[PDB]
Design a protein around this ligand. Structure first.
Ligand SMILES: [K+]
Ligand SMILES: [K+]
Ligand SMILES: [K+]
Ligand SMILES: [Mg+2]
Ligand SMILES: [Mg+2]
Length: 136
RNA sequence: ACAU
DNA sequence: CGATGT
């Protein structure tokens, strides 16, 4: 603790895993929805969590904001740190779109800088992240 | 085990 | 119960 309330919180939502994936980012303090990605027909939870963080980085950088990002995904936080999404999802025609977005997110990370802290949301202490989809 |  | 990940 404690929660850094001046922050952006992101989360994935899905219908199946693998399944339809979407994500959104919210103001941690107010819950205001700041961005929401159109659903992607097939992806994994972790790909979506990764895309949500990278989109947050891009959203904050464009707005000259130094706020941190919270994610509840140990996996996606590590993938962003490594600039490499180590997903097991088959690459095929059905998964081409999510894999294109993941490839492009990695490419963005490899061509841009940021100081944004990427912080673990401590669900066990604080409850569900503010960007959660309320589906579980 | 832990994080989803 | 199933799945994605370290
Ligand atoms: K949920
Ligand atoms: K969770
Ligand atoms: K497991
Ligand atoms: Mg999550
Ligand atoms: Mg959630």
């Amino acid at each position: 603790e404690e929660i850094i309330w001046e922050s952006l919180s992101v989360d994935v939502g899905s219908q199946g895993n693998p399944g339809i994936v979407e994500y959104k980012g919210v103001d941690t303090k107010t819950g205001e929805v700041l961005f929401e990605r159109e659903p992607i027909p097939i992806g994994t939870n972790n790909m979506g969590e990764f895309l949500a963080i990278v989109h947050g980085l891009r959203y904050l950088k464009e707005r000259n904001s130094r706020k941190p990002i919270y994610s509840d995904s140990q996996t996606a936080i590590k993938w962003v740190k490594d600039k490499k999404a180590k997903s097991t999802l088959v690459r095929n025609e059905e998964t081409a779109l999510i894999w294109k977005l993941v490839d492009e997110a990695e490419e963005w990370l490899n061509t841009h800088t940021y100081e944004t802290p990427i912080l673990k949301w401590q669900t066990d202490k604080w409850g569900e992240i503010k960007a959660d989809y309320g589906r579980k």
